[model samples]
Target: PRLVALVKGRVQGVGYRAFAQKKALELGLSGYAENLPDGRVEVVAEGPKEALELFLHHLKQGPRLARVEAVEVQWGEEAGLKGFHVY
Candidate 1:
């Protein structure tokens, strides 16, 4: 399965992309995280349902900087990628 999210809010929140990749890699997931036009992060990760949920769990507390509305998640089919990276 795949997981998608758009992270918002910023309280001295920097390095979010790196933080995102860090968790994805830690879970042996595949996909990418990118910066958006609105200073938000868009993440696409593919892996196990549990891993994906855990991934979002980390994101939920991303640097503990993410606001309540920042940790948004959506689900999708795999895109067949092989690495967890940032863009």
Candidate 2:
């Protein structure tokens, strides 16, 4: 499945993007995690169901520096994404 997640609160400047990218890469997923102008981070990925599930779980917790308040996700068909990135 494809996953588009909007994560809110204290997520920026805390290695959240790198954390997401690393985890996704480890899960053999493809996509990117970026910081939005509005203080939220958007993570888009495509991969196996179990991997995506575990990814989402980790996203909610984020890195040690990140204080993730909420996570909103939109799931659908795969988008054929490439390697994971952080931007």
Q: lDDT of all predictions, in order shown?
A: 0.81, 0.94
Query: By lDDT, who's the top model here?
Result: 2
lDDT, candidate 1, at 12: 27
TM-score of each: 0.86, 0.97
Name the lDDT of candidate 2.
0.94
Q: What stretches of model 1 exceed 4 Å from their correct place?
A: 11-13, 64-68
Candidate 2 residue-wise lDDT, 1-87, digit = tens: 999999999999898999999999999999999889999999999999899999999999999989999999999999789999888
Question: Per-residue lDDT of 1-87 in model 1, one digit per residue for the tens?
Answer: 988887777722567778878889999999998877777788899999999999988776776555535667889899798998777
RMSD of each: 2.0, 0.6
Worst 10 residues of 1 by lDDT: 62-71
Colliding residue pairs in candidate 2: none
